[PDB]
Design a binder for these strands. Structure first.
Ligand SMILES: Nc1nc2c(ncn2[C@H]2C[C@H](O)[C@@H](COP(=O)(O)NP(=O)(O)OP(=O)(O)O)O2)c(=O)[nH]1
Ligand SMILES: [Mg+2]
Ligand SMILES: [Mg+2]
Length: 430
DNA sequence: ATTATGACGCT
DNA sequence: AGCGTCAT
């Protein structure tokens, strides 16, 4: 009753760039704009592997993870941009720099948590309180929400998508009690006004379009963001959760798309997030552990407490390359040369990071995969990172991995290596 | 031969 | 510390 917390204390937004790498390439090359196009890494094997797809190309069935040759079968006029190659490997610098452009704009409005190269959470609670004081009980005009959808509306008592959007928005705004400065629905609405402004700023100052979700916590904001992509934002209220979750496959919620989500489905004999409400917190904890159980009990009611962390910069800086099938590294000279290539890219990125961000990494993590292992990493070993020198980093990585070499011969490497990975971690202020 | 990352939980 | 999971 009156003591049952409803998880309506915060206003949280999730901003995700639409087809990011594609937009970066379309800004640089206007010939790619408003066209079916995709971004690929490498080229020789099946035309390269697609990692980003414009919405025009998605209409033909083009997806991430698809080989470009296969994509061309679905979309013969598909245009392709290739990721830059440096020191024999894909180099993603252009997209990391474009990311910084966007994240610095977002940081003007509120503290953000960088969740990936193209998305960030925003805690708008305080900004919303400020705007509400400025409004002075003035109603919110639909003109202030020109790209906002209200999930679950319209309802009750009409052909085109924009007319649907506007009808739902008008139903929402008509039911708003702008008198109450602590109404959660009002707070969400003001949050959506601020996010319209943030997205306008991003597009004006970078040329990039994005989508966004506005809700009371990170998981609902993330889910909302995907409901109306591209170039739109969606508000998911606390009240919309029962209907939304009643037909929501468990796998659609962040964290449940893998083995745990499959176990929830299999053990409980359910399919949708809303079915979880029928179990007690102790029941869920008994199946999925104390932490997962409490999280599921709250999440199926729309409640989640994970804070937006004040963290605009990545916590690690890493360099990885796969060596599939017959390109695996089977000599010591090979392994040394590629450790050096990775280490040289890492040195360049670390030196730039130190100059920009006033910090130094102190730990080097070396991960490898050996032929036959189906795991991402076969082995992971750390050593100290005391100088930004690629030859030293690569020599140290070799020293910590050289005992994996089964070959009695000194020149050969067996079993051959199918992946190398260097990761700088444990940053300190400098 | 699905690649290149990044975050975070467990023990 | 080293390994596993999840995202994409
Ligand atoms: N290297 C690499 N980059 C990837 C991979 N997957 C994604 N990226 C890169 C390329 C992506 O552009 C970028 C952002 O990932 P999203 O937000 O998941 N996809 P997007 O922004 O394209 O479309 P949407 O409009 O649906 O949000 O991350 C991968 O497997 N490998
Ligand atoms: Mg995106
Ligand atoms: Mg994203």
């Amino acid at each position: 009753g009156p003591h049952m917390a409803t998880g309506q204390d915060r206003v949280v937004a999730l901003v995700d760039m639409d087809c990011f790498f594609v937009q970066v390439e379309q800004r640089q090359n206007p010939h790619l704009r408003n066209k079916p196009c995709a971004v690929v890494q490498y080229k020789s094997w099946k035309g390269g592997g697609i990692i980003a797809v414009s919405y025009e190309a998605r209409a033909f069935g083009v997806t991430r993870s698809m080989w470009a040759d296969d994509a061309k079968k679905l979309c013969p006029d598909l245009l392709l941009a290739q990721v830059r190659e440096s020191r024999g490997k894909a180099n993603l610098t252009k997209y990391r720099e474009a990311s910084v452009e966007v994240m610095e704009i977002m940081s003007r409005f509120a503290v953000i948590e960088r969740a990936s190269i193209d998305e960030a959470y925003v805690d708008l609670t305080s900004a919303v309180q400020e705007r509400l004081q400025k409004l002075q009980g003035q109603p919110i005009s639909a003109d202030l929400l020109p790209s906002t959808y209200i999930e679950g509306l319209p309802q009750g008592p009409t052909v085109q998508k924009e007319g649907m959007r506007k009808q739902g928005l008008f139903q929402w705004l008509d039911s708003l009690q702008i008198d109450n400065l602590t109404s959660p629905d009002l707070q969400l609405t003001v949050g959506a006004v601020i996010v319209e402004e943030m997205r306008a700023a991003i597009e004006r100052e970078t040329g990039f379009q994005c989508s966004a979700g506005i809700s009371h916590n990170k998981v609902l904001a993330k889910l909302a963001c995907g409901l109306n992509k591209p170039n739109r934002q969606t508000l998911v209220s606390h009240g919309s959760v029962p209907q939304l979750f009643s037909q929501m496959p468990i796998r659609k919620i962040r964290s449940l798309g893998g083995k745990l989500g499959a176990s929830v489905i299999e053990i409980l004999g359910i399919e949708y997030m809303g079915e979880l409400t029928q179990f007690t917190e102790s029941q869920l904890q008994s199946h999925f552990g104390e932490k997962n159980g409490s999280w599921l009990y709250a999440m199926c009611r729309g409640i989640e407490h994970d804070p937006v962390k004040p963290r605009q910069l990545p916590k690690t800086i890493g360099c990885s390359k796969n060596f599939p099938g017959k390109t695996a590294l089977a000599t010591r000279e090979q392994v040394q040369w590629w450790l050096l290539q990775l280490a040289q890219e890492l040195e360049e990125r670390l030196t730039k990071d130190r100059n920009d961000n006033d910090r130094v990494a102190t730990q080097l993590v070396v991960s490898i995969r050996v032929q036959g292992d189906k795991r991402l990493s076969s082995l992971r070993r750390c050593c100290a990172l005391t100088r930004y020198d690629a030859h030293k980093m690569s020599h140290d990585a070799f020293t910590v991995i050289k005992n994996c070499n089964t070959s009695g011969i000194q020149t050969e490497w067996s079993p051959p290596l199918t992946m190398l990975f260097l990761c700088a971690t444990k940053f300190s202020a400098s």
